[PDB]
Design an enzyme around this catalytic site. Sequence first.
Site, PDB file in Angstrom:
ATOM      1  N   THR A 197       0.842  -1.202   0.000  1.00 29.78           N
ATOM      2  CA  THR A 197       0.000   0.000   0.000  1.00 29.78           C
ATOM      3  C   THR A 197       0.880   1.255   0.000  1.00 29.78           C
ATOM      4  O   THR A 197       1.776   1.384   0.834  1.00 29.78           O
ATOM      5  CB  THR A 197      -0.931   0.008   1.221  1.00 29.78           C
ATOM      6  OG1 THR A 197      -1.901  -1.036   1.072  1.00 29.78           O
ATOM      7  CG2 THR A 197      -1.667   1.343   1.348  1.00 29.78           C
ATOM      8  N   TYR A 237      -7.012  -7.416   8.444  1.00 26.45           N
ATOM      9  CA  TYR A 237      -8.131  -6.878   7.658  1.00 26.45           C
ATOM     10  C   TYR A 237      -9.355  -7.791   7.828  1.00 26.45           C
ATOM     11  O   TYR A 237      -9.329  -8.669   8.668  1.00 26.45           O
ATOM     12  CB  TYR A 237      -7.745  -6.671   6.192  1.00 26.45           C
ATOM     13  CG  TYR A 237      -6.908  -5.426   5.946  1.00 26.45           C
ATOM     14  CD1 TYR A 237      -6.576  -4.563   6.987  1.00 26.45           C
ATOM     15  CD2 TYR A 237      -6.467  -5.111   4.670  1.00 26.45           C
ATOM     16  CE1 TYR A 237      -5.811  -3.419   6.754  1.00 26.45           C
ATOM     17  CE2 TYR A 237      -5.705  -3.968   4.426  1.00 26.45           C
ATOM     18  CZ  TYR A 237      -5.383  -3.129   5.476  1.00 26.45           C
ATOM     19  OH  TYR A 237      -4.631  -1.988   5.242  1.00 26.45           O
ATOM     20  N   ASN A 266      -2.902  -4.540  13.509  1.00 23.83           N
ATOM     21  CA  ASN A 266      -4.350  -4.336  13.511  1.00 23.83           C
ATOM     22  C   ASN A 266      -5.073  -5.215  14.523  1.00 23.83           C
ATOM     23  O   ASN A 266      -6.209  -5.664  14.297  1.00 23.83           O
ATOM     24  CB  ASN A 266      -4.940  -4.478  12.104  1.00 23.83           C
ATOM     25  CG  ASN A 266      -4.582  -3.300  11.208  1.00 23.83           C
ATOM     26  OD1 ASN A 266      -4.435  -2.172  11.682  1.00 23.83           O
ATOM     27  ND2 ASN A 266      -4.449  -3.555   9.909  1.00 23.83           N
ATOM     28  N   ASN A 297      -2.897  -9.655   8.040  1.00 23.97           N
ATOM     29  CA  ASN A 297      -2.671  -8.291   8.507  1.00 23.97           C
ATOM     30  C   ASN A 297      -3.843  -7.612   9.211  1.00 23.97           C
ATOM     31  O   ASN A 297      -3.925  -6.386   9.240  1.00 23.97           O
ATOM     32  CB  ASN A 297      -2.181  -7.422   7.343  1.00 23.97           C
ATOM     33  CG  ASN A 297      -0.867  -7.911   6.775  1.00 23.97           C
ATOM     34  OD1 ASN A 297       0.018  -8.319   7.520  1.00 23.97           O
ATOM     35  ND2 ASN A 297      -0.749  -7.908   5.455  1.00 23.97           N
ATOM     36  N   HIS A 350      -6.372 -11.323   0.103  1.00 20.60           N
ATOM     37  CA  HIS A 350      -5.758 -10.917   1.364  1.00 20.60           C
ATOM     38  C   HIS A 350      -6.552 -11.440   2.558  1.00 20.60           C
ATOM     39  O   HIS A 350      -7.697 -11.034   2.793  1.00 20.60           O
ATOM     40  CB  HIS A 350      -5.649  -9.398   1.451  1.00 20.60           C
ATOM     41  CG  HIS A 350      -4.929  -8.910   2.671  1.00 20.60           C
ATOM     42  ND1 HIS A 350      -5.536  -8.123   3.627  1.00 20.60           N
ATOM     43  CD2 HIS A 350      -3.643  -9.065   3.071  1.00 20.60           C
ATOM     44  CE1 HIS A 350      -4.656  -7.823   4.567  1.00 20.60           C
ATOM     45  NE2 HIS A 350      -3.500  -8.382   4.253  1.00 20.60           N
TER      46      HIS A 350
HETATM   47  C1  LIG Z   1       4.439   0.567   3.338  1.00 21.12           C
HETATM   48  C2  LIG Z   1       3.875  -0.830   3.392  1.00 21.12           C
HETATM   49  C3  LIG Z   1       2.673  -1.162   2.762  1.00 21.12           C
HETATM   50  C4  LIG Z   1       2.183  -2.468   2.809  1.00 21.12           C
HETATM   51  N1  LIG Z   1       1.011  -2.783   2.193  1.00 21.12           N
HETATM   52  C5  LIG Z   1       0.534  -4.045   2.238  1.00 21.12           C
HETATM   53  C6  LIG Z   1      -0.711  -4.438   1.569  1.00 21.12           C
HETATM   54  O1  LIG Z   1      -1.348  -3.586   0.904  1.00 21.12           O
HETATM   55  N2  LIG Z   1      -1.106  -5.717   1.665  1.00 21.12           N
HETATM   56  C7  LIG Z   1      -0.414  -6.650   2.351  1.00 21.12           C
HETATM   57  O2  LIG Z   1      -0.841  -7.826   2.412  1.00 21.12           O
HETATM   58  N3  LIG Z   1       0.731  -6.356   2.986  1.00 21.12           N
HETATM   59  C8  LIG Z   1       1.245  -5.112   2.957  1.00 21.12           C
HETATM   60  N4  LIG Z   1       2.437  -4.813   3.619  1.00 21.12           N
HETATM   61  C9  LIG Z   1       3.187  -5.883   4.290  1.00 21.12           C
HETATM   62  C10 LIG Z   1       4.262  -6.323   3.256  1.00 21.12           C
HETATM   63  O3  LIG Z   1       3.697  -6.932   2.068  1.00 21.12           O
HETATM   64  C11 LIG Z   1       5.328  -7.251   3.834  1.00 21.12           C
HETATM   65  O4  LIG Z   1       4.681  -8.442   4.310  1.00 21.12           O
HETATM   66  C12 LIG Z   1       6.059  -6.575   4.997  1.00 21.12           C
HETATM   67  O5  LIG Z   1       6.491  -5.255   4.630  1.00 21.12           O
HETATM   68  C13 LIG Z   1       7.281  -7.343   5.497  1.00 21.12           C
HETATM   69  O6  LIG Z   1       8.261  -7.529   4.474  1.00 21.12           O
HETATM   70  P1  LIG Z   1       9.628  -6.689   4.364  1.00 21.12           P
HETATM   71  O7  LIG Z   1      10.398  -6.841   5.645  1.00 21.12           O
HETATM   72  O8  LIG Z   1      10.307  -7.299   3.155  1.00 21.12           O
HETATM   73  O9  LIG Z   1       9.200  -5.233   4.175  1.00 21.12           O
HETATM   74  C14 LIG Z   1       2.937  -3.502   3.554  1.00 21.12           C
HETATM   75  C15 LIG Z   1       4.129  -3.168   4.184  1.00 21.12           C
HETATM   76  C16 LIG Z   1       4.620  -1.875   4.129  1.00 21.12           C
HETATM   77  C17 LIG Z   1       5.916  -1.537   4.824  1.00 21.12           C
END
Ligand SMILES: Cc1cc2nc3c(=O)[nH]c(=O)nc-3n(C[C@H](O)[C@H](O)[C@H](O)COP(=O)(O)O)c2cc1C
Lengths: 399, 399
Positions: free
Chosen positions: B37, B196, B251, B194, B191
Amino acid sequence: SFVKDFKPQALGDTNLFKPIKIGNNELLHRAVIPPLTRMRALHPGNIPNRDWAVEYYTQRAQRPGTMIITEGAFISPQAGGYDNAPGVWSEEQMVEWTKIFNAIHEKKSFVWVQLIVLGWAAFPDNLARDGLRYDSASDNVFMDAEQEAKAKKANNPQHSLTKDEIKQYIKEYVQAAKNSIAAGADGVEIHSANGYLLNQFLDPHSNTRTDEYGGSIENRARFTLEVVDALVEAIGHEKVGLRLSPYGVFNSMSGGAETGIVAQYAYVAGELEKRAKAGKRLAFVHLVEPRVTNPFLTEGEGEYEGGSNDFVYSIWKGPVIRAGNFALHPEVVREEVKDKRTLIGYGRFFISNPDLVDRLEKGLPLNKYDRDTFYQMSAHGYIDYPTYEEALKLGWDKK
Amino acid sequence: SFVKDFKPQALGDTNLFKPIKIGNNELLHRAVIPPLTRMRALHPGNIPNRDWAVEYYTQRAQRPGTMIITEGAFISPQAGGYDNAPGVWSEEQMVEWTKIFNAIHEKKSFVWVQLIVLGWAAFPDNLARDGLRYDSASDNVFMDAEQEAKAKKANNPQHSLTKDEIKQYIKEYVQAAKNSIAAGADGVEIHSANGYLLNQFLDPHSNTRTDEYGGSIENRARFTLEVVDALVEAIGHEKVGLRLSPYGVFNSMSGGAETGIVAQYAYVAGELEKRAKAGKRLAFVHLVEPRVTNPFLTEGEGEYEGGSNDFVYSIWKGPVIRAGNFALHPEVVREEVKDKRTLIGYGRFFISNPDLVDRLEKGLPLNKYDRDTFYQMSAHGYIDYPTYEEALKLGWDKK
Ligand SMILES: Cc1cc2nc3c(=O)[nH]c(=O)nc-3n(C[C@H](O)[C@H](O)[C@H](O)COP(=O)(O)O)c2cc1C
Ligand SMILES: Cc1cc2nc3c(=O)[nH]c(=O)nc-3n(C[C@H](O)[C@H](O)[C@H](O)COP(=O)(O)O)c2cc1C
Ligand SMILES: [Cl-]
Ligand SMILES: [Cl-]
Ligand SMILES: [Mg+2]
Ligand SMILES: [Mg+2]
């Protein structure tokens, strides 16, 4: 003779030889004797063997601080069906058990009675002879063709347990656990593995009930957890353990072929941990490994490589005893015991090595076991396996 | 600038750079862009950003054969509540999505739309403005104090979904998936992570219903599995994946503190494998690791060491995408990709490194990310992070 193509490894430098507390017992090492049915009990009365059973357990208690789980013991006649396995319901039986427990304690070791109920594993003809039912969770699938044949000849139909009959079994579990502790046992293990009655309820293949005891994960687990709670209340959480075999197929259980099997066992583990935070943590959970999905098969056969018990450690936070083909795999044990709450059960090689613990410590050769005497009515293959010293005197290093 | 105290490792010699088939897509490597996101969508209409979104995805599609999962997209207005996240219900939206999909495909990469429904994570005041409900599984616990405050001020009470309203959401999922595929997407990700809506049903903390949608493992999982089945029927199993976060606390989900949490997720995995043998195997299961229980916390914070996702591999036999703090831990990735069906999602460092895949292959320094622009309405921190070549030209090796 010794196992020929085996390269022993000394495990004295591992956690297998670090002390650990299990329930009220200060174990001096983590090599556990898992429950091993030996069929030396005498008929009538399912009486522990008056001639040999004390010697058998004394031999295997020889290393100080060893945890011993007994052969499975029937909680009642209706729970039985093997003429030569022992029970823990009668005074006659408990007199013999008390001598066994005293002998083990004299060697500074510990004893936990495994409590069993056969369900569909029982011999229907034995039960019919004694005017007993042939019980299971359900009545629309049989264990196998041989059992179906025995049921037909005996005119003794597989009976789906009514609710009050489940309650009666629970009463018998409670009295059996009380009998065990009163006679001197350190604790009891609830057998919920290997396709016996509690496992028959846990498994969607053998449990096709539509009442509160089947039809879902919570329902299939109901009977097992009721026994756990009844026993914790009766004799204390610190005197109770639970045995499970998630990937077992012995006695017609589903194993990994059932896609819901991990969820079913994860739920049980979760409920135990729930109670553990609720102040009533079981002394241990004992798991049969997918290393051995059927204990009748030679080591290395019936291995299931598609599943692991490791999931249990993410859920249950107490001691875990793991059993299955570890004697011939010290390299595997060395890795598994790095986890500081893991104990290792050695079954078949404790049958054949009364001094197994010394042999594991020092990396000595192991006596081969003799499957033919696993279930014979004999001292041979029961109390005449040699210690390493005796084996050398017999010239076994030359055979 | 580059990440200062990081010692990169070339991963070109690992399975991370072996091709793999996911659904209909021939991935050329196993570094996946997980859904991120970014809040650049425009209001009114939740429209993908007309100025920058194509460029953002084009940049990140640059390595041929890369699987990209989009930022979460609302299936309907009632499913939303963030003014600047995109939807996939309207023609206005799909016109922009189509340009995005074409751009990614022009780079020989792949695109999967993540479909989201906020439930209690939504802003109640935004919803009230638009005459929409504030939805969740139940109505007796709120997400947190800030959300309670927003609900009070907006006079918009957290509403426990009626059954027909759940059915309406299912209708919207189906249309949203159809819209996505029709507009050119390679597939969709459901999804269910997280915290939701679907996760709010899965979790015993947020789901205290007493109907068929709560009160047990099977019931709590009902909504998620209904969406899975509706979508497999609508667009095909090979165009559908599922995202889960068993240990997540983001959440207000339970994570490992809930002793039943592994059973809940094991059940879902089991049901997917069941369908997989029933001929309808999902393209993948995507897991958020306990490495990151909350994505807002800096790498290394909010780690849960008391649980592992490894249990899923004992149950589900298809591809598994794992995400959470892998960019800074090539030593961990090297081990995890030895499993031949494991892919690795890199979130925050794909935000900051459009050429992340080249950098992983060759062991190059990584651009630091800028958390302040994760959710800004700006091209800055969205489309102006440099490739390694551009970074060198900017003298970043000297900062
Ligand atoms: C800025 C941001 C936006 C994210 N948006 C989503 C999302 O829209 N849907 C989702 O399932 N996870 C979302 N996540 C979780 C990520 O997909 C991922 O699981 C998480 O950042 C951990 O991975 P990383 O350490 O490689 O960042 C988001 C994470 C971040 C930091
Ligand atoms: C002869 C024999 C009798 C057994 N009896 C029991 C029993 O009464 N209860 C039980 O839970 N398991 C029983 N088992 C299973 C063992 O406790 C153990 O899990 C199994 O033998 C695998 O371990 P191993 O490879 O170390 O022998 C038995 C196994 C054997 C070979
Ligand atoms: Cl018999
Ligand atoms: Cl907003
Ligand atoms: Mg012989
Ligand atoms: Mg700034």
